[PDB]
Every structure is written in structure tokens, then in C-alpha cells.
Design a protein around this ligand. Structure first.
Ligand SMILES: COc1ccccc1C(N)=O
Ligand SMILES: COc1ccccc1C(N)=O
Lengths: 237, 300
């Protein structure tokens, strides 16, 4: 059933599972036409499919050509997402296929369940957690590969860099969701935090800066301040 | 006109015959029902005065044999039986009519209600849903489970309705997932009508039988079957025009006949609001939408 604060450690057990977030699959820029009407222009999108235990991120880039000539794009995007996740599962060896897929939005349940009828043993689950995966496009290297794609493409990342060498997957996921929550609440501030000190760099094969354990504690504290702050500037407290 | 005689009425019981019903007191001199119209299936049904639990009854067609009711004090119910000796039966019935010991099937001449509720229902198809092949009539009660209910526990006592599952490999063609889920015409027309039911008359027959078992016995499994058959048609963009017109008439008479006070349990709010107001056929059921809106505006 649904995933929530009570069964949170289940994410880091040894049953293969994936989160699927579809919030960046269909993206549009709304603009005025010469006649003074409004139109949309689609831009490249991505499916965010993440193993929370290992950090493996299957980033399926959604090129705008997939929308050409199609109607009801908002509804098509959920079935396109489900088709691509299904194709991903089918491409994995049996022993790498997930036992559970957790969708971040309840509207993905039926599209994914229907595309996975062939996999009766894979549980499709919602969640009550408000996960900040929409902010994935605030990670510069992920945004860059999506916007440069000229065709459909799958790119594989580890969203934890090398963190699992030093911390558990529970702690790595907590760090990831704090970073992403901050980027979602105030992208400018969050990004200022992560890069202010020019001596801390991002390795070519990484997404985030190479912080020492001590510097991550500083960083993490500065993100909780930001999130609390913005919650002030928002609600006035 | 045919007759279903009763050996006796040893226990107080409300007896239904199709959409009619009457009370019989314990050991009252009741010996059955006469003037039953030939040409239709019928249902004779029972609710004991001491235990409203278990409504039960028998589907039958008098063209198929001579049937009577006899109370069984061991199993505690009124049982339908067949009399093979035609002259014995005629002689029994004639004696009971001469002594005026039978109620008359009370059909008003203007009234087509029973025809309109059973137009496509045939005994041969009832007997495939209700498997008990040594009898020409079929027993149904409030508690019997459907085959689909048994998949989600006695198989001999099940209602074998056609399995309707919208998220099933039968319903959804590989590669047409979105198309087939959002527009069920493939499942309705190819899988169910051409493949399983063969024609729409057989589809409507099962739909009508499911409704009648829901209404007369409060059979929950039959209610699901009825709502599912309706929803499969309303959720199909492509339906023969004659089928939509006939469905409108079928449902109209079902909604007309439904007890006003059972609407809360016998009508599924989601299915009806979807069918009448969101589905492909939202504008194709004029008679049904008008009676629903005037009789059950709360549900909507
Ligand atoms: C801009 O994307 C949309 C537009 C309208 C409705 C939904 C969506 C979406 N991505 O789900
Ligand atoms: C006929 O539909 C059913 C059959 C058995 C159990 C459940 C259902 C249903 N409506 O979900």
C-alpha cells in the first residue's frame, strides 16, 4: 500500500525498489501569440527514476518531438512515463528488476499498473511523502543533459556521488532530499550555499561538491536554515 | 397461463413472484400461484418472517416442466421441485383451483414491466451462470458469491457471471495500453461481444439477470456485475447505435422498478455519475438520465 513516515526504513532494505517522478516529463513555456492569444511551447523533459538504496538514477530524457501532433499532452505524459518505466524494467536482467515501484503522484498509478500487467509480482505503490524530486532540474549537470538532447536518450547517474563510501543509504537519501527541498524552496540561495567557497569543486564524474564530512554538516545546517527562513518569508513568522 | 402449486405453507413467509409479493401466515391454507404468464422466465422468492437473513428463490420457465414448491423441514426452506407425472400434476392443480387456494399472478394489462426487465433473459443462459444441471430451474440467494469474487469459496454454489476486469491482460492490448484503458471499445466489441457473448442480446441478458438478482436477493456480487456491464458500454467510444438505444430502455425500466429505499445500497454513485456525465455515452442515455435525475437526484 501507500508509503509514508511509518514505513520509511523500508526504502533502505534489500528489496530492489524504484521511485518514479513524472513532474518534469511534460514542461511548457507559456507565451503570447502575435494575435494576443496564449500558446505553449514544450521543452525537453525527463523521467526521474531512482533506486534510493544505491543512488542509481535512470534519467530518461523526453525530447519535445514525442509531443508532435499529439493531443491532451498532460494525460499522454503519464502513459509515456509508464511506457518508458515498463521498457526500462523489461531491459533489466530479472535479478535487477524492482520488486516495488513507488510513484510520487497518485495519477501515475493506473498508467503504470496497466503498462506493468505483464509483471504481476511488481507492486505499484503511492506515497504520502511530499518528495522534492521536481527540483531535479536544479542540479546543473542534469538540467544540462536534458536541455542539450536532440533525441530520446537514457542517461545513468549516481545521485549520491561517492557518499555511500562514508554514510548509509538512509543518511544519503536524507541528505539528497534536504538538498532538493532547499533547491525547490529557494533555488538561488540553495545554489549560493553549495558553491560559495571556490575551493570546493565538483568532480567531473559527480553532481555535487566534494565536501568533507565536516563541511557537509555545515552545508546541511545552512540548508535547514534556508528552508526554515523561506518558511518565514513565506508565512511571516 | 401456468401454475406453481405449493404442498403447504408451514412457516410464515413473504413470497415474491417477479416484481410482486405477498405475506403468508404460518400454516395458512395457501397452495400456490396461478395465471403465470407464459413466454417469460419468472422468479419465485422467499423471505422468512423469523429470519429476514437469506432471501432466496428460483428462476424457472413453465414451458420447461411442471414445477411446485414444498417446504423441507430438515433444510429449513421452501424448495422447488419438478413433477414428471403430468396427469398427477394437472389433477393436483385443478383440485387447488376449484377450492380457490391459489393467488393469481396479478398482471395489469397495460403493464409491460416484467417483459421490459427480462427481454433478453433466457433460461438456458441462467443455467450456465447458475450450475446445477439436474434441475430445470435455478436457485439463487443473497449470500452466493461470483467466480470473480472467489478469485479475490464453494465453486458449486457460485454465480458464474462473465469476468469483467478493466486492468487485465484480456482488456488491454500490448502496445495500446493508454488507448484501450481510456476507450474500452476493443474490450466491449472484440473481446466480449464478438468473442464471449457472441451477440448483444446475450450481453443484455446477463446484465438484466445480474440486476434482478441484485434487486430481489440483495446479492452484492450481482450488483458489481450489473454496474461493470453498464460501465463497459458507457466507457466505449464506439458502440452500435442499436445497443445504446436498447441499453437506455433497459436501464430506464430497472431504475423505474428499483425500490426507492434500496437506492442507497443498490446504486453505485461513481459508476452512475461517470456514465451519465463523463463517459463517451454521457449524451446517449436520455431516458435513463431523465428518470435518474428526477428519482435519485441525491446520488448525483
Ligand atoms: C506543463 O505541464 C502540464 C500542463 C498542464 C497540466 C499538467 C502538466 C503536467 N506536466 O503534468
Ligand atoms: C464485477 O466487478 C467486480 C467483480 C468482483 C469484485 C469486484 C468487482 C469490482 N467492481 O471492482
Amino acid at each position: 500500500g501507500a508509503m509514508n513516515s511509518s514505513n520509511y526504513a523500508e526504502l533502505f532494505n534489500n528489496d530492489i525498489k524504484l521511485f518514479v517522478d513524472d513532474t518534469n516529463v511534460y514542461r511548457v513555456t507559456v507565451h503570447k501569440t502575435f494575435e494576443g492569444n496564449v500558446a505553449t511551447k514544450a521543452i525537453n523533459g525527463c523521467i526521474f527514476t531512482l533506486n534510493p538504496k544505491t543512488g542509481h538514477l535512470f534519467l530518461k530524457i523526453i525530447h519535445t518531438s514525442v509531443w508532435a501532433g499529439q493531443k491532451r499532452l498532460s494525460q499522454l505524459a503519464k502513459w509515456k512515463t509508464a511506457e518508458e518505466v515498463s521498457a526500462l524494467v523489461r531491459s533489466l536482467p530479472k535479478e535487477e528488476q524492482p520488486k516495488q515501484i513507488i510513484v510520487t503522484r497518485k495519477a501515475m498509478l493506473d498508467p503504470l499498473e496497466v503498462h506493468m500487467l505483464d509483471f504481476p509480482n511488481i507492486a505499484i505503490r503511492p506515497t504520502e511523502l511530499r518528495l522534492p524530486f521536481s527540483a531535479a532540474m536544479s542540479i546543473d549537470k542534469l538540467s544540462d543533459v536534458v536541455m542539450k538532447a536532440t533525441e530520446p536518450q537514457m542517461v545513468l547517474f549516481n545521485i549520491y556521488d561517492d557518499w555511500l563510501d562514508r554514510i548509509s543509504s538512509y543518511t544519503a537519501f536524507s541528505r539528497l532530499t534536504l538538498l532538493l527541498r532547499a533547491l525547490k524552496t529557494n533555488e538561488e540561495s540553495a545554489k549560493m550555499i553549495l558553491l560559495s567557497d571556490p575551493t570546493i569543486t565538483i568532480k567531473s564524474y559527480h553532481l555535487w561538491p566534494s565536501f568533507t564530512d565536516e563541511q557537509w554538516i555545515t552545508i546541511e545546517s545552512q540548508m535547514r536554515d534556508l528552508i526554515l527562513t523561506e518558511y518565514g518569508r513565506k508565512y511571516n513568522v | 397461463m401456468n401454475t406453481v402449486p405449493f404442498t403447504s405453507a408451514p412457516i410464515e413467509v413473504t413470497i415474491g413472484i417477479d416484481q410482486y409479493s405477498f405475506n403468508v401466515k404460518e400454516n395458512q391454507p395457501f397452495h400456490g400461484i396461478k395465471d403465470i404468464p407464459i413466454g417469460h422466465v419468472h422468479v419465485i422468492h422467499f423471505q422468512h418472517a423469523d429470519n429476514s437473513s437469506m432471501r432466496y428463490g428460483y428462476w424457472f420457465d413453465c414451458r420447461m416442466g411442471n414445477f411446485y414448491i414444498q417446504y423441507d423441514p430438515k433444510d429449513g426452506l421452501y424448495k422447488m421441485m419438478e413433477e414428471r407425472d403430468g396427469a398427477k400434476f394437472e389433477n393436483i392443480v385443478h383440485n387447488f383451483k376449484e377450492r380457490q387456494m391459489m393467488v393469481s399472478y396479478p398482471k395489469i394489462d397495460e403493464d409491460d414491466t416484467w417483459y421490459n426487465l427480462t427481454e433478453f433473459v433466457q433460461m438456458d443462459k441462467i443455467r450456465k451462470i447458475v450450475r446445477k444441471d439436474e434441475n430445470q430451474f435455478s436457485y439463487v440467494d443473497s449470500s452466493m458469491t461470483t467466480v470473480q469474487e472467489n478469485e479475490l469459496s464453494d465453486p458449486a454454489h457460485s454465480l458464474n457471471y462473465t469476468v469483467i476486469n478493466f486492468k487485465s491482460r484480456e482488456a488491454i492490448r500490448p502496445g495500446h495500453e493508454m488507448e484501450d484503458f481510456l476507450d474500452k471499445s476493443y474490450y466491449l466489441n472484440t473481446v466480449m461481444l464478438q468473442g464471449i457473448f457472441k451477440n448483444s442480446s446475450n450481453y443484455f441478458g446477463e446484465l438484466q439477470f445480474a440486476f434482478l438478482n441484485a434487486m430481489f436477493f440483495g446479492n452484492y456480487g450481482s450488483s458489481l456485475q450489473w454496474h461493470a456491464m453498464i460501465e463497459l458500454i458507457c466507457s466505449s467510444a464506439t458502440v452500435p447505435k442499436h445497443m445504446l438505444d436498447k441499453l437506455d430502455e433497459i436501464l430506464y425500466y430497472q431504475i423505474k422498478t428499483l425500490p426507492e429505499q434500496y437506492s442507497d445500497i443498490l446504486l453505485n454513485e461513481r459508476v452512475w455519475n461517470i456514465c451519465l456525465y463523463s463517459s463517451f455515452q454521457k449524451n446517449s442515455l436520455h431516458n435513463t438520465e431523465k428518470i435518474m435525475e428526477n428519482k435519485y437526484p441525491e446520488l448525483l
